[PDB]
Amino acid sequence: SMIQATFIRRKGILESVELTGHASGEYGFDIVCAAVSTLSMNLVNALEVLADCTVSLQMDEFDGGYMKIDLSYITNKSDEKVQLLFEAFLLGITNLAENSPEFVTAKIMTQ
Amino acid sequence: SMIQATFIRRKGILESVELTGHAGSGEYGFDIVCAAVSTLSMNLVNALEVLADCTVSLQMDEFDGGYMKIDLSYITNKSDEKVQLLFEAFLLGITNLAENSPEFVTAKIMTQ
Ligand SMILES: [Ca+2]
Ligand SMILES: [Ca+2]
């Protein structure tokens, strides 16, 4: 199947990412899925543990799976450590999109 | 097949990490874990360069299970806030894999 990641950047800072497809494909897709799940879970964990950042997170396993990490209402969303971890996450997803376009599509939107 | 990661912390800062086994073994469960480890590994290298203004020394090979060592010991800005945050995030991810999949990943943290 396909993983689609949609990032929203507002006033220069990353605020949210929405992913669909994280939950059935060939071997190659299983491997890409593992890479995306790992990066996603490490962002949430590193935000909480290392950047003193409470994340809003919606996740479900239905019809391909859905995940949204949303900092839009989080007080220290524009924090340097927060934004660094988010940028690193964006970098990893972008590299997967570049290396594995058959399995990953990324949209970055400024608002 | 087993991934072994060895982190060295010196005077409070992460200085190096050495990994072996992550090249895969040909077993489904382990290769999913290997994919997780390689993704985090390569993201640390790429994020350090792109986002933390830090070019690492990096040795890598694919022989007998794979070897990788990221070494900041000689880099003058090893102690930088962005550099250490990325490195601690990587340690956090590896440690979480060691917790969740002990049968595939073992970690050593050494404060020498
Ligand atoms: Ca491209
Ligand atoms: Ca334990």
Side-chain angles (χ1 to χ4, degrees), chain A residues 27 30-31 34-36 38-39 42 45-47 49-51 80-82 84-85 87-89 91-93 95-96, chain B residues 28 31-32 35-37 39-40 43 46-48 50-52 81-83 85-86 88-90 92-94 96-97:
Chain A
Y27 180 84
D30 287 354
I31 289 296
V36 165
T38 302
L39 283 169
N42 194 59
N45 288 331
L47 285 172
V49 176
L50 299 175
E80 179 194 322
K81 301 182 170 221
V82 168
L84 179 67
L85 290 172
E87 288 295 348
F89 173 69
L91 185 57
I93 295 297
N95 289 147
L96 289 157
Chain B
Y28 180 84
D31 294 350
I32 289 306
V37 174
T39 302
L40 287 172
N43 194 240
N46 292 338
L48 282 167
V50 171
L51 302 166
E81 197 185 295
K82 294 176 176 177
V83 166
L85 178 60
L86 291 171
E88 294 274 4
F90 177 66
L92 183 62
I94 298 297
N96 285 338
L97 291 164

Side-chain angles (χ1 to χ4, degrees), chain B residues 1 6 15 28 53 61 65 68 70 73 82 86 100 107 110:
Chain B
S1 25
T6 304
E15 295 217 322
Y28 180 84
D53 185 31
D61 70 74
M68 182 186 319
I70 301 152
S73 302
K82 294 176 176 177
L86 291 171
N100 293 178
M110 320 208 59

Side-chain angles (χ1 to χ4, degrees), chain B residues 1-48 50-62 64-112:
Chain B
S1 25
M2 164 64 58
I3 297 155
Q4 298 152 1
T6 304
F7 296 82
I8 298 172
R9 193 179 296 272
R10 303 199 178 84
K11 305 295 184 185
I13 70 156
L14 290 167
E15 295 217 322
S16 67
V17 61
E18 173 182 335
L19 299 102
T20 62
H22 50 284
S25 67
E27 292 140 17
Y28 180 84
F30 174 76
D31 294 350
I32 289 306
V33 171
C34 285
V37 174
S38 301
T39 302
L40 287 172
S41 277
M42 292 294 322
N43 194 240
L44 174 70
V45 173
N46 292 338
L48 282 167
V50 171
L51 302 166
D53 185 31
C54 180
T55 298
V56 312
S57 168
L58 170 68
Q59 186 52 69
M60 288 188 60
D61 70 74
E62 310 283 284
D64 347 304
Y67 176 81
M68 182 186 319
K69 181 171 188 177
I70 301 152
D71 190 351
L72 297 176
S73 302
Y74 298 84
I75 308 308
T76 27
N77 74 331
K78 60 192 175 169
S79 67
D80 270 18
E81 197 185 295
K82 294 176 176 177
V83 166
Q84 288 297 304
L85 178 60
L86 291 171
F87 211 151
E88 294 274 4
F90 177 66
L91 170 63
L92 183 62
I94 298 297
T95 299
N96 285 338
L97 291 164
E99 282 309 282
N100 293 178
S101 302
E103 75 279 11
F104 302 123
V105 190
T106 300
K108 300 196 293 168
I109 320 318
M110 320 208 59
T111 60
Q112 70 186 228

Side-chain angles (χ1 to χ4, degrees), chain A residues 1-38:
Chain A
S1 344
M2 169 72 52
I3 290 175
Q4 294 151 37
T6 301
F7 293 82
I8 298 307
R9 186 184 294 271
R10 302 193 179 89
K11 296 87 209 165
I13 65 156
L14 286 164
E15 290 200 343
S16 69
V17 57
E18 188 179 307
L19 295 109
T20 67
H22 92 258
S24 259
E26 48 179 292
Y27 180 84
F29 184 64
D30 287 354
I31 289 296
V32 166
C33 279
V36 165
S37 292
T38 302

Side-chain angles (χ1 to χ4, degrees), chain A residues 41-47 49-61 63-105:
Chain A
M41 290 302 98
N42 194 59
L43 175 64
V44 169
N45 288 331
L47 285 172
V49 176
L50 299 175
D52 197 17
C53 186
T54 177
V55 133
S56 171
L57 176 66
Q58 191 49 241
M59 287 194 58
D60 78 70
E61 292 308 296
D63 191 279
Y66 172 86
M67 199 198 82
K68 182 157 179 175
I69 298 163
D70 190 355
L71 307 183
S72 303
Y73 295 86
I74 306 296
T75 191
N76 65 336
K77 67 185 176 175
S78 71
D79 183 82
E80 179 194 322
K81 301 182 170 221
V82 168
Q83 287 302 124
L84 179 67
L85 290 172
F86 213 152
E87 288 295 348
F89 173 69
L90 170 60
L91 185 57
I93 295 297
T94 299
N95 289 147
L96 289 157
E98 290 299 288
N99 285 340
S100 291
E102 73 271 23
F103 296 131
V104 181
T105 300

